[PDB]
RNA sequence: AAGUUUGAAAAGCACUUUGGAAAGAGAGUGAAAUAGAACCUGAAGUCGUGACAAAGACAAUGGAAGUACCUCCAUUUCAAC
RNA sequence: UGGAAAUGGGGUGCCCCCACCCGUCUUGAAACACGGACCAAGGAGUCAAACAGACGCGCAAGGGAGGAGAUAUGCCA
RNA sequence: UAAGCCCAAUUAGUGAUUGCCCAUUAUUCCUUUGGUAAGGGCGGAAACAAAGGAGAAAGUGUAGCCCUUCCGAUGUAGAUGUGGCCUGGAGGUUAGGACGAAGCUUAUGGCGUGAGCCUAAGAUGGACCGGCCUCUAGUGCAGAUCUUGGUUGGCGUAGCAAAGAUCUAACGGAGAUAUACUCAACAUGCAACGUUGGAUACUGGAGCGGGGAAGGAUUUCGUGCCAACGGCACUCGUA
RNA sequence: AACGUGUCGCGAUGGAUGACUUGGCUUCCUAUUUCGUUGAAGAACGCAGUAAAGUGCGAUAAGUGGUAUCAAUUGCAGAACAUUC
RNA sequence: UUAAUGAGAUUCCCUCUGUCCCGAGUUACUAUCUAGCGAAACGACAGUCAAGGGAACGGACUUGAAGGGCUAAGCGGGGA
RNA sequence: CACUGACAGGGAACGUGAGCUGGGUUUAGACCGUCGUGAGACAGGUUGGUUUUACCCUACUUAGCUGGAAAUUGCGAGAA
């Protein structure tokens, strides 16, 4: 078993995924979730504008004590950020899904994202040095991402 | 500390395509890939996603008796019965 | 004789009423007394010897070995 | 003109006797369980094919041999009983399994006061194992500042602030000038890297100069490479 | 509205359980059974076509000689008395 | 008892001043916002008050008074 | 000792140490007196002697977003 959900019509759908991405899971969770119901072209425009810092990514769940901004009002929030490392990773994933649709013989201008899921992957371990001769964990948290889109 | 315990047999994924690569989407081997490499089974705890139920502020949990809605459950009945 | 009715179970919400946090020492705990983030696996009246009582079994003015030997026996501690 | 205090009533000089509300108490009915428990039955009366039915054990304890009757029932420390429940192995006996064993999952119901037992489904698994009578033991977990492994809120938070510092163009590189429509360009690909040439600074001869001992032992050099490591980054490196 | 709560289907992280066992522990028996200056036990360094560890071996170095057997060893090279060189 | 000496203990005087009357203004690095990276302590469950009684100082109990939800920067009354 | 209208008395864990300070009291060094054979003692004197942590909940101070009268539902209807 691969994907937690199944497209309505398989012959008019494209899929993509990536494992052990080495981006912060909490940052990638917010970046991927905002495009869940959007058309493919509209999702790609949003990521370009986030890199230009004219629009932001809303942080809805993992947002404890982050800054407030005026660009979060269009999402009905007050807190948002511009995580560039997560954005460029999601840009590559959309290109792969677009390539799969063209190979099948579909129109990328008529595709709508219908499924986005981000999960925690296995962690990697480093160490840090504290006062009074203590050693304490210094961990990294990568993530898995999967998605598919369907033609309207 | 640590069973290299995949599979009967490596037959360990030729080839197309997107990517700098890692990899993804197809195709194929095999009874099984939900057996893809330290790979039999794969629990608890924790997390993501979809559908649904609602819900002020009485921390939450709990008892007793009803009601609204649901029920991949059980049993009974279907003709001067 | 059906995508049937009915009666019991099961699930979630709601209403009226009821309802102090577990384990422990202590005369007295809910306590401003101590141990208490979650789960899996592990974790504590045992073996031997002397004595006594209750109960079961064999024999009885007798009861019973132990060590050892002998041959079925050269499969059989 | 009490909903206060002291007396006194029960529908009021009309006719005689109990105004009303609330218990794990009292009376009564149903069911369970145990007795210093109390009784009865247990020689199969006779007769009876489908197309009135079953049962009837001489019995401590059961799915209690059956029926009738009476009484008691809470409890820390503690004692005892249970044809009382559950786990690993042994002697017997009786079954199951590739038409799918063990294990695992549950808005799968049924049974039992309960410990628990059994069935259903798996769109799970792939080779062993259940019941009954005896025997045996390293035989049942919620907590011991318990042991070992894993996870987790705090949390994208505290912070990554001594030693003054970099700027520019051109090469290199996948690391860019990366767009669906509209459209001239900005308002839709950001940030970051090595080398060379310029510019600007620092060390300031008790030097981030050039050589040795102790200690280290290939860290030296060239080419390549960027999975992990250099707590930011790398096309670079004592990797 | 959002955050948050609850139940169900699916998926992650994690490595428990079951089945398996060339290992351990314990109890018995047999005998022409007990090392070294004729240099032992232990320590070091080396040896393969390819060879880091481990195993075996010692410049005759993953081994020479003899007896028995009877066609392999194998990741890839290489070699090729069968009457048994 | 003692000249010289003392990061030794003590009292007064001159000079001096933000020690104070009584505070005000400026600078570098922080805190604060962003990109990358990323912990610990602690953690029964939780978290609005007044009086009452109670192991004689309650977040939970009795009777009253408050209380729409979610958040950013600070603070040091309580969490005996 | 002065000024003034006057220089009243008390509580708040003998209010207030993750607010400060550390002079006193009360470790380890050392001197004196008295006591003890002695090691040592003295609510007797003297000198020198580390003051740790907030990023959690609440309270308080400011600073933002946002539903809602059956206080999220009923279609359950009330106009100062
Ligand atoms: Mg902060
Ligand atoms: Mg440090
Ligand atoms: Mg399998
Ligand atoms: Mg597996
Ligand atoms: Mg799980
Ligand atoms: Mg209670
Ligand atoms: Mg006491
Ligand atoms: Mg108690
Ligand atoms: Mg108290
Ligand atoms: Mg104690
Ligand atoms: Mg005799
Ligand atoms: Mg009775
Ligand atoms: Mg009793
Ligand atoms: Mg055992
Ligand atoms: Mg459940
Ligand atoms: Mg035990
Ligand atoms: Mg356990
Ligand atoms: Mg920060
Ligand atoms: Mg900084
Ligand atoms: Mg600092
Ligand atoms: Mg500096
Ligand atoms: Mg650029
Ligand atoms: Mg330059
Ligand atoms: Mg020098
Ligand atoms: Mg780094
Ligand atoms: Mg020689
Ligand atoms: Mg109070
Ligand atoms: Mg009120
Ligand atoms: Mg705050
Ligand atoms: Mg405080
Ligand atoms: Mg007082
Ligand atoms: Mg203090
Ligand atoms: Mg204080
Ligand atoms: Mg002092
Ligand atoms: Mg003396
Ligand atoms: Mg002093
Ligand atoms: Mg309404
Ligand atoms: Mg209305
Ligand atoms: Na000089
Ligand atoms: Na408390």
| Residues paired with A146 in a beta bridge | A17, A117
- Spatial separation of the C-alpha atoms in residues A57 and A47, rounded to whole Å: 9
Strand B, nucleotides < 7 Å from a protein CB: these are 17-19, 21-26, 34, 47-50
* Inter-residue contact A7 to A13 (CB < 8 Å): yes
* Inter-residue contact A72 to A78 (CB < 8 Å): yes
* Inter-residue contact A16 to A78 (CB < 8 Å): no
Q: Which helix (H) or strand (E) holds A99?
A: helix A84-104
* Inter-residue contact A49 to A55 (CB < 8 Å): yes
- Which position has the token pair 């959900």? A5
Specified resolution (Å):
2.4
Q: Which residue from A25, A59, A47, A54 is spatially nearest to A68, judged by alpha carbons?
A: A59
Query: DSSP assignment, residue A62?
Result: S
Instruction: Report if CB A65 to strand G is under 7 Å.
Output: yes
Strand D near-CB residues (< 7 Å), A 96-135: 109, 120, 123-124, 126, 128-129
Helices (H) and strands (E) in chain A, counts: 3, 7
* Inter-residue contact A112 to A42 (CB < 8 Å): no
- Spatial separation of the C-alpha atoms in residues A122 and A91, rounded to whole Å: 23
* Inter-residue contact A150 to A38 (CB < 8 Å): no
- Spatial separation of the C-alpha atoms in residues A1 and A15, rounded to whole Å: 14
User: Based on the number of CB atoms within 10 Å of its own CB, is A42 exposed (0-12), middle (13-18) or buried (19 or more)?
Assistant: exposed
Strand F, nucleotides < 7 Å from a protein CB: these are 32-40, 71-73
**Ligand nearest to the Cα of A134, by number:** 2
Tally Cβ neighbours within 10 Å of residue A112.
14
Strand D, nucleotides < 7 Å from a protein CB: these are 151-152, 154-158, 178-180, 187-191, 228-231
- Spatial separation of the C-alpha atoms in residues A119 and A15, rounded to whole Å: 17
Q: Say how far A28 CA is from B22 C1', in Å.
A: 19
């Amino acid at each position: 078993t691969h994907y937690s959900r199944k497209p309505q019509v398989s012959s008019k759908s494209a899929k993509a995924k990536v494992s052990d991405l080495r981006c912060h899971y909490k940052n990638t969770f917010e970046t991927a979730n905002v495009i869940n119901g959007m058309p493919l072209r509209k999702a790609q425009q949003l990521y370009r504008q986030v890199l230009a810092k004219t629009r932001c990514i809303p942080f809805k769940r993992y947002n404890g004590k982050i800054g407030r901004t005026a660009q979060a009002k269009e999402w009905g929030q007050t807190k948002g950020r511009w995580p560039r490392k997560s954005v460029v990773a999601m840009m590559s994933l959309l290109k792969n899904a677009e390539a799969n649709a063209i190979e099948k013989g579909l129109d990328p201008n008529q595709m709508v994202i219908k499924h986005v899921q981000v999960d925690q992957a296995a962690r990697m371990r480093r160490r840090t040095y504290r006062a009074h001769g203590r050693i304490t964990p210094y961990m990294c948290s990568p993530c898995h991402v999967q998605l598919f889109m369907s033609e309207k």
